[PDB]
Scaffold this active site. Structure first.
Site, PDB file in Angstrom:
ATOM      1  N   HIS A  84      41.318  76.951  73.193  1.00 12.29           N
ATOM      2  CA  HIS A  84      41.029  76.408  71.875  1.00 12.29           C
ATOM      3  C   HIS A  84      42.049  75.322  71.553  1.00 12.29           C
ATOM      4  CE1 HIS A  84      38.638  76.739  68.227  1.00 12.29           C
ATOM      5  NE2 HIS A  84      38.049  77.806  68.734  1.00 12.29           N
ATOM      6  N   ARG A 138      19.768  86.465  58.757  1.00 13.04           N
ATOM      7  CA  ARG A 138      19.929  86.589  57.315  1.00 13.04           C
ATOM      8  C   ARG A 138      19.395  87.906  56.773  1.00 13.04           C
ATOM      9  NH1 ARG A 138      20.225  81.806  58.783  1.00 13.04           N
ATOM     10  NH2 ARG A 138      21.294  80.138  57.636  1.00 13.04           N
ATOM     11  N   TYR A 191      35.883  70.344  54.145  1.00  8.38           N
ATOM     12  CA  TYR A 191      35.032  69.580  55.050  1.00  8.38           C
ATOM     13  C   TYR A 191      34.343  68.417  54.350  1.00  8.38           C
ATOM     14  CZ  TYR A 191      35.779  73.936  57.561  1.00  8.38           C
ATOM     15  OH  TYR A 191      36.352  75.033  58.163  1.00  8.38           O
ATOM     16  N   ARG A 218      24.283  73.455  58.894  1.00  2.00           N
ATOM     17  CA  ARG A 218      25.570  72.877  58.520  1.00  2.00           C
ATOM     18  C   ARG A 218      25.763  71.505  59.151  1.00  2.00           C
ATOM     19  NH1 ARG A 218      31.602  75.052  60.285  1.00  2.00           N
ATOM     20  NH2 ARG A 218      32.782  73.598  58.966  1.00  2.00           N
ATOM     21  N   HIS A 240      32.439  81.106  57.048  1.00  2.00           N
ATOM     22  CA  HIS A 240      33.476  80.784  56.073  1.00  2.00           C
ATOM     23  C   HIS A 240      33.312  81.590  54.790  1.00  2.00           C
ATOM     24  CE1 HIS A 240      33.348  77.539  58.959  1.00  2.00           C
ATOM     25  NE2 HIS A 240      34.513  77.088  58.530  1.00  2.00           N
ATOM     26  N   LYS A 299      19.452  74.469  47.288  1.00  2.00           N
ATOM     27  CA  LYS A 299      19.215  74.009  48.656  1.00  2.00           C
ATOM     28  C   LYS A 299      18.024  73.060  48.717  1.00  2.00           C
ATOM     29  CE  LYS A 299      20.983  75.998  52.829  1.00  2.00           C
ATOM     30  NZ  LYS A 299      21.935  74.860  52.969  1.00  2.00           N
ATOM     31  N   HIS A 349      47.638  64.958  64.998  1.00  2.00           N
ATOM     32  CA  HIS A 349      48.284  66.033  64.254  1.00  2.00           C
ATOM     33  C   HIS A 349      49.787  66.030  64.493  1.00  2.00           C
ATOM     34  CE1 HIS A 349      44.723  67.915  62.653  1.00  2.00           C
ATOM     35  NE2 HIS A 349      44.184  68.072  63.849  1.00  2.00           N
ATOM     36  N   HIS A 396      43.179  63.177  68.932  1.00  2.00           N
ATOM     37  CA  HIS A 396      43.073  63.911  67.677  1.00  2.00           C
ATOM     38  C   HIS A 396      44.236  64.883  67.506  1.00  2.00           C
ATOM     39  CE1 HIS A 396      40.773  66.198  64.502  1.00  2.00           C
ATOM     40  NE2 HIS A 396      41.597  67.131  64.943  1.00  2.00           N
ATOM     41  N   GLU A 397      44.560  65.638  68.559  1.00  2.00           N
ATOM     42  CA  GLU A 397      45.639  66.617  68.457  1.00  2.00           C
ATOM     43  C   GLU A 397      47.002  65.939  68.415  1.00  2.00           C
ATOM     44  OE1 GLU A 397      45.088  69.765  67.791  1.00  2.00           O
ATOM     45  OE2 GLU A 397      42.951  69.264  67.834  1.00  2.00           O
TER      46      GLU A 397
HETATM   47 BR   LIG Z   1      40.557  73.153  74.488  1.00  2.00          BR
HETATM   48 BR   LIG Z   2      21.073  79.622  54.307  1.00  2.00          BR
HETATM   49 ZN   LIG Z   3      42.477  69.005  64.636  1.00  2.00          ZN
END
Ligand SMILES: [Br-]
Ligand SMILES: [Br-]
Ligand SMILES: [Zn+2]
Ligand SMILES: *[C@@H]1O[C@H](CO)[C@@H](O)[C@H](O)[C@H]1NC(C)=O
Ligand SMILES: [Br-]
Ligand SMILES: [Br-]
Ligand SMILES: [Br-]
Ligand SMILES: [Br-]
Lengths: 596, 195
Positions: free
Chosen positions: A327, A151, A497, A255, A487, A463, A360, A356-357
């Site tokens: 990926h 940071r 999300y 996160r 992001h 926060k 999709h 999961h895929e």
């Molecule tokens: Br993969």
């Molecule tokens: Br942070």
């Molecule tokens: Zn996915």
């Protein structure tokens, strides 16, 4: 005439040039993704250049049809989609300033180094160096220099770029009738559909805040139980009634709390269910994994995989010298071409992500009946929510016993169930206050409610308050800690999300009620419930042809977000946490600091 | 024993575009309908008014064979009482149609990696085709009210489009070869029998 009828003819022509032009872009993109090559980069770039060229021509053509003159909502929704460009309205001198800044932020983030003060020879990138420290290290000081260094080095460089980024992004949004850039980002949830299916952009703030207030009690008990367990690891730095220090939460930003499982596991004597050894025991391969996934969707009344799916997909890392980056992705190339690109291994993880895929893919196949411009999820969060609920049913012991990866004599302990729910909460529930507070900060910054003299003053005030997380080192207005996340630095909206987390449990609860599953929701298995599939197909086939509120109502019965399915999912953990925390402070005081 | 030229029709090197569909008159010969094994994995044989089983037992005066190439999901439009681009603008069968429709996948023969744009179809027409009508017009389609001038001008369209055929397409987008056998009976001679 009746320009609609003139626009239908235009759309009739558009749906042929567009549908196959977009196909060439996918084929070139697939060629690079499955064979990384200097030459293949050129074909993908040029094919996409053609596709982006055409599309922006057709927008002009479609903009010569007054949208206030069309009665067909489908024709309206198609013409509507061809508009809404972006930074094109920005002046040429300001346009290149913005994309200058964006590429600068993206690069200094991806290339930023942080050096350990004890060893100047030890300078680490985020991936893989600093990530390894934040995901695994249990030393307070080692985590501190990586957290502060990241940071301080890349955060401070992004601070003046972001102040210019906010101003420039606001001006482009104001030149698009939007209030600010945050208002522009909320346009991904705006719906002007029939009757009471409409959804304003301002509603998203209220509905997110309303839902989060109902999630706060569950998060606080998870926060307190994690805090009480972290005392046994950082006794000198953990306040039993204060916020958790930011640099001790399992990653660079807090996160996800997924990596706190070892320190916070309810019953460490019970191992997590892992059918990986079974899969090697029965000599499963990658083809077997997707065959079982196909059977799962067939069992609920969904179509099989296409013949071209088996022939053209990449269900295994190539062993013929082709270089690809592993990926997981599910592709909708169009023209009936559906593929999945996975370096599938014989592990329980890749078994779950395959469902999961393929989840999709089933979405993509269902709305192929829609026009090209309406072939997408109802909003940005529908697709990942649909894929996630397939992993939920697949991972249940109910499903694994039917598949043969668990013994039919399998005994699941209530302790193992709590161990599983706790791990789910660390990832699912832990990220909700992080996601909400982060996007709220950006929303107010674009709205101009946080002056640049208060950017880092508010950020840690929110926060501490919303997330219950306190900075270990005071940061003045030279820092930009939100920009220290991928992001934020790469110009991506973040509320997805939060919404898709709520969507998936709304989906699962409705499908499990249709399947008439008795018992806790987290144990539900929609397999062999054709009724659940049709209720799922009623939303999948819609695509983006109807407002997301209407598409949501088709499957779950309500036209808005609801967190009670999420709380219902975690109800066994909620009561367990309340018993565990009956002698612990539940909540946090925002006054205490590790540097107090 | 004069064998009817079915090898010309079914096993032709290249078929016609559906807008310019090809008709092959057949007469004064012996019709052996049993040679059609499958010649494709996905394959269709639909008959109306006549029975294909015991078809090589009847006699007809003339037997017209119409051939063209369409997509897999437009094959249902080659049938009586059907609507859609192919039925409305390219090839229309009558409500009381008597005959058979034979369709089979031709992905190996008609699809090319670089795309096969040779097969065409009509996308716009002022009105539907009458049954068995053939329109090979190339006049610019006037969608608006300003006359279309012959080319450049807004709300104008060339009436014919291109079937792009790539082998990785889904079955519904893959090329299918269609043969339509029209059976004509004015009784009296019935020169086409084919035991
Ligand atoms: Br993969
Ligand atoms: Br942070
Ligand atoms: Zn996915
Ligand atoms: C087309 O050729 C195949 C093999 O070459 C043959 O079996 C078939 O009978 C032929 N079709 C016709 C209509 O002659
Ligand atoms: Br490194
Ligand atoms: Br706000
Ligand atoms: Br339930
Ligand atoms: Br056969």
């Amino acid at each position: 005439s009746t320009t609609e009828d003139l626009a239908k003819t235009f759309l009739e022509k558009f749906n042929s040039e567009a549908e196959e032009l977009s196909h060439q872009s996918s084929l070139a993109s697939w060629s690079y993704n499955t064979n990384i090559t200097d030459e293949n980069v050129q074909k993908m770039n040029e094919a996409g250049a053609r596709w982006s060229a055409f599309y922006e021509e057709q927008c002009k053509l479609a903009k010569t049809y007054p949208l206030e003159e069309i009665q067909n909502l489908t024709v309206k929704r198609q013409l509507q989609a061809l508009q809404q460009s972006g930074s094109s309205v920005l002046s040429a001198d300001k346009s290149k300033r913005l994309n200058e800044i964006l590429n600068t932020m993206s690069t200094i983030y991806s290339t930023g180094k942080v050096c350990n003060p004890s060893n100047p020879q030890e300078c680490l990138l985020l991936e893989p160096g600093l990530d390894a420290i934040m995901e695994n290290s249990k030393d307070y000081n080692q985590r501190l220099w990586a957290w502060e260094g990241w940071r301080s080095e890349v955060g401070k460089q992004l601070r003046p770029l972001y102040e210019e980024y906010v101003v420039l992004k606001n001006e482009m949004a104001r030149a698009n009738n939007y209030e600010d850039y945050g208002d522009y980002w909320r346009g991904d949830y705006e719906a002007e559909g029939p009757s009471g299916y409409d959804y304003s952009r301002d509603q998203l703030i209220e509905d997110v805040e309303r839902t989060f207030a109902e999630i706060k009690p569950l998060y606080e008990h998870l926060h307190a139980y994690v805090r009480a367990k972290l005392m046994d690891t950082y006794p000198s730095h953990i306040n039993p009634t204060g916020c958790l220090p930011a640099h001790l939460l399992g990653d660079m930003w807090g996160r996800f709390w997924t990596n706190l499982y070892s320190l916070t596991v309810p019953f460490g004597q019970k191992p997590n269910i892992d059918v990986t050894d079974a899969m090697v025991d029965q000599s499963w391969d990658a083809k077997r994994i997707f065959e079982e996934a196909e059977k799962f969707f067939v069992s609920v009344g969904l179509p099989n995989m296409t013949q071209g799916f088996w022939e053209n997909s990449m269900l295994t890392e190539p062993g013929d010298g082709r270089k690809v980056v592993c990926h997981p992705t599910a592709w909708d190339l169009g023209k009936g071409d559906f593929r999945i690109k996975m370096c599938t291994k014989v592990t329980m993880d890749d078994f779950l992500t395959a469902h999961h895929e393929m989840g999709h893919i089933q979405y993509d196949m269902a709305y192929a009946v829609q026009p090209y411009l309406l072939r997408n999820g109802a909003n940005e969060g529908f697709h990942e929510a649909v894929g996630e609920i397939m992993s939920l049913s697949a991972a249940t012991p109910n499903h694994l016993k039917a598949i043969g990866l668990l013994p039919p004599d399998f005994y699941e302990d209530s302790e193992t169930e709590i161990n599983f729910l706790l791990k789910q909460a660390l990832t699912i529930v832990g990220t909700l206050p992080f996601t909400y507070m982060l996007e709220k900060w950006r929303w107010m910054v674009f709205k101009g409610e946080i002056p640049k003299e208060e950017w880092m003053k508010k950020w840690w005030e929110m926060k501490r308050e919303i997330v219950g997380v306190v900075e270990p080192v005071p940061h003045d207005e030279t820092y930009c800690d939100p920009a220290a996340l991928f992001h934020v630095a790469n110009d991506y909206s973040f509320i997805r999300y939060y919404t898709r987390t709520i969507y998936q449990f709304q989906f699962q609860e409705a499908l499990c009620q249709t399947a008439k599953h008795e018992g806790p929701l987290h144990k539900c298995d929609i397999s062999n419930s054709t009724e659940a599939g049709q209720k799922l197909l009623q939303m999948l086939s819609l695509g983006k042809s109807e407002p997301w509120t209407l598409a949501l109502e088709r499957i779950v019965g309500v036209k808005n977000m609801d967190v009670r399915p999420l709380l219902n999912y975690f109800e066994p953990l909620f009561t367990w946490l309340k018993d565990q925390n009956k002698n612990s402070f539940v909540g946090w005081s925002t006054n205490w600091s590790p540097y107090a | 024993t004069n064998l009817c030229p079915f090898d010309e029709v079914f096993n032709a090197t290249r078929f016609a575009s559906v807008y310019a569909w090809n008709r092959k008159r057949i007469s004064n010969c012996v019709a052996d309908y049993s040679v059609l094994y499958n010649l494709a994995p996905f394959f269709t044989f639909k008959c109306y008014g006549v029975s294909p089983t015991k078809l090589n037992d009847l006699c007809f005066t003339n037997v017209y064979a119409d051939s063209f190439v369409i997509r897999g999901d437009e094959v249902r439009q080659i049938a009586p009482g059907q609507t859609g681009n192919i039925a409305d603008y390219n090839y229309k069968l009558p409500d009381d149609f008597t005959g058979c429709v034979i369709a089979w996948n031709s992905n190996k023969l008609d699809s090319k990696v670089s795309g096969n744009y040779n097969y065409l179809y009509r996308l716009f027409r002022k009105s539907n085709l009458k049954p068995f009508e053939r329109d090979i017009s190339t006049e610019i389609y006037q969608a608006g009210n300003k006359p279309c001038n012959g080319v450049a001008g807004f709300n104008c369209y060339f009436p014919l489009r291109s079937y792009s055929f790539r082998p990785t397409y889904g079955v519904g987008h893959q090329p299918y070869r269609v043969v339509v056998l029209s059976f004509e009976l004015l009784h009296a001679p019935a020169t086409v029998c084919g035991p």
